[PDB]
Amino acid sequence: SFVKDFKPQALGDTNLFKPIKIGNNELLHRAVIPPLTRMRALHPGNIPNRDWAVEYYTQRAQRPGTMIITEGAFISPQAGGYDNAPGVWSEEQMVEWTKIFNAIHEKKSFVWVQLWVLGWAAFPDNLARDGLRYDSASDNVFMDAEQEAKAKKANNPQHSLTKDEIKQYIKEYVQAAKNSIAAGADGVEINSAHGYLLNQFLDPHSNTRTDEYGGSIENRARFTLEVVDALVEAIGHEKVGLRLSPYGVFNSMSGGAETGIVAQYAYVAGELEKRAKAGKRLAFVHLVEPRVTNPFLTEGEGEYEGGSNDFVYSIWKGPVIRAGNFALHPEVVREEVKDKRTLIGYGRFFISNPDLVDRLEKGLPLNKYDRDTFYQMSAHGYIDYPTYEEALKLGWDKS
Numbered sequence: 389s390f391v392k393d394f395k396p397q398a399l400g401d402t403n404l405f406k407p408i409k410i411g412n413n414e415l416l417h418r419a420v421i422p423p424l425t426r427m428r429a430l431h432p433g434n435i436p437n438r439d440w441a442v443e444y445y446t447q448r449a450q451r452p453g454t455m456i457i458t459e460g461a462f463i464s465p466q467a468g469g470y471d472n473a474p475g476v477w478s479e480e481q482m483v484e485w486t487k488i489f490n491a492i493h494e495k496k497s498f499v500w501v502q503l504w505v506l507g508w509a510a511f512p513d514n515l516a517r518d519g520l521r522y523d524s525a526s527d528n529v530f531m532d533a534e535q536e537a538k539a540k541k542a543n544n545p546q547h548s549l550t551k552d553e554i555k556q557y558i559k560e561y562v563q564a565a566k567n568s569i570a571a572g573a574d575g576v577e578i579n580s581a582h583g584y585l586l587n588q589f590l591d592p593h594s595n596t597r598t599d600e601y602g603g604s605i606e607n608r609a610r611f612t613l614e615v616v617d618a619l620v621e622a623i624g625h626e627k628v629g630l631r632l633s634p635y636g637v638f639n640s641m642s643g644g645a646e647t648g649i650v651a652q653y654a655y656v657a658g659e660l661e662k663r664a665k666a667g668k669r670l671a672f673v674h675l676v677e678p679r680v681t682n683p684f685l686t687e688g689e690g691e692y693e694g695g696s697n698d699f700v701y702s703i704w705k706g707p708v709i710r711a712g713n714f715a716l717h718p719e720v721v722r723e724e725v726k727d728k729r730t731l732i733g734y735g736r737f738f739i740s741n742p743d744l745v746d747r748l749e750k751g752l753p754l755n756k757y758d759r760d761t762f763y764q765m766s767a768h769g770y771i772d773y774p775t776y777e778e779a780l781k782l783g784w785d786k787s
């Protein structure tokens with residue numbers, strides 16, 4: 389069915405539908421598909437689903453000039469920990485990724501691959517199964533109760549990365565970025581948000597190191613900046629974007645309770661723009677909004693008013709994508725896009741509406757999303773959401 393008490397608003401007379409150039413890509417509009425894990429990848433091998441992947445993406449790449457940011461993908465075996473999330477380190481993985489990339493392109497849309505590294509968010513059992521470590525910045529702070537229960541049951545303790553293992557992850561980043569480009573992706577996105585490894589180093593609560601990787605705004609931000617600097621040399625700055633979540637609390641991150649949280653992030657921005665002046669300006673900066681501090685909280689739940697993302701605009705002068713409870717607040721997006729370099733990432737509503745863009749343009753009703761199939765091994769709740777026409781044919785009230 390459609391969203392019940394939702395009063396849609398046509399957004400075609402806004403900047404959301406004005407073209408803009410991101411990297412080498414020329415989008416026909418500014419409503420992007422943010423990275424979304426759906427757990428349909430095949431085990432073993434973390435192979436992208438060969439039965440439904442192309443169809444799912446293809447349905448979403450229907451409105452021409454759309455920028456699609458893929459589900460997070462592990463850059464390596466030690467970077468993962470989820471059996472059904474896809475990888476981007478093997479041939480078997482890349483063969484299926486090329487098919488995907490082609491279909492999106494055939495529909496005249498673009499595709500950026502999110503490079504993923506779990507850190508303490510990965511299941512220790514899975515890693516221990518395959519003889520892998522349970523990595524993280526520190527080893528005297530854990531994610532949560534069950535995460536430590538799992539870790540010990542499987543006798544796979546949290547391991548503080550050495551400077552050499554940190555370098556190894558950087559190797560793995562470059563390579564994954566190359567195979568993504570080599571396979572035909574328009575560029576990659578560095579996931580340095582939602583509490584995964586990179587964020588785990590940025591954050592003062594999770595990072596209690598004393599070396600060159602801990603102890604100061606400069607040191608915490610070091611691992612993140614070294615990936616940006618490594619990927620920029622391997623595939624070029626206009627094929628590299630960074631995703632951050634300043635006020636995120638997901639996966640045990642500090643957020644607005646950390647009095648120095650803003651200073652930590654203003655520092656990352658300042659350095660990104662520094663490089664921008666040196667010619668090397670990243671394709672974008674993706675920003676998860678405080679509106680949502682936890683993706684698995686209903687729209688409206690986990691809203692942080694004590695903080696804002698606006699400060700980034702003062703430092704970074706490039707394109708900035710914003711994701712966070714925008715679908716049901718067109719009146720908010722209206723104001724937000726009045727700014728000239730801002731894109732809106734729609735997540736939960738891009739799952740249920742493969743034709744979201746047109747619905748957004750025309751202020752047409754939205755399809756309710758089924759929270760239960762987000763992470764299901766099924767095609768249902770995956771590729772079977774109907775477009776407006778079909779919902780009308782189904783009679784989701786209007787026959």
Ligand SMILES: Cc1cc2nc3c(=O)[nH]c(=O)nc-3n(C[C@H](O)[C@H](O)[C@H](O)COP(=O)(O)O)c2cc1C
Pocket residue numbers: 422423424425426459460502579581582631676680683711712713714715733734735736737762763
């Ligand atoms: C099913 C699901 C999976 C997600 N997977 C990822 C992920 O792989 N990486 C990422 O950084 N964000 C992920 N997100 C967060 C989205 O990118 C987006 O920021 C979030 O849904 C908030 O926007 P919304 O209100 O439009 O959904 C996910 C969200 C959902 C609901």
